[PDB]
Structures are given as structure tokens and as C-alpha cells.
Homo-oligomer: A and B are copies of this chain.
């Protein structure tokens, strides 16, 4: 348990035409952390009032 399924790597695209005097850098990433079943975890917590 605790796998991080990954659709793709990080990518970079760039755009400057038909812009106005300006290179633009765009980056994207699709990643998520999602566990299977609810077992084997704690917080703690650890609290005041």
C-alpha cells in the first residue's frame, strides 16, 4: 500500500509567436498519491486546548 500512480513525466512547452516580445515557458505534470485500503496509518495528534 501507498503507491503513487503516474500518467506522465513533467514536460515543458514554449510560446512566443504570435506574442508580443516575450518568451513564455509552460510546464505540466500529472501525478497523484492514492492508497488502496484504509489500514496501516496514524496521525498523532498530539494536541493542546
Contacts and interface: CB of A to CB of B under 8 A. Distances in A.
Contacts of A14: 18
Contacts of A28: 21
Interface residues of A, number: 10
A37 interface: no
Contacts of A20: 15, 26
A18 B17 contact: no
Interface in A1-49: 13-15, 17-18, 20-21, 24, 26, 28
13 contacts: A13-B17, A13-B18, A13-B21, A14-B18, A15-B17, A15-B18, A15-B20, A17-B17, A18-B24, A18-B26, A20-B26, A21-B26, A21-B28
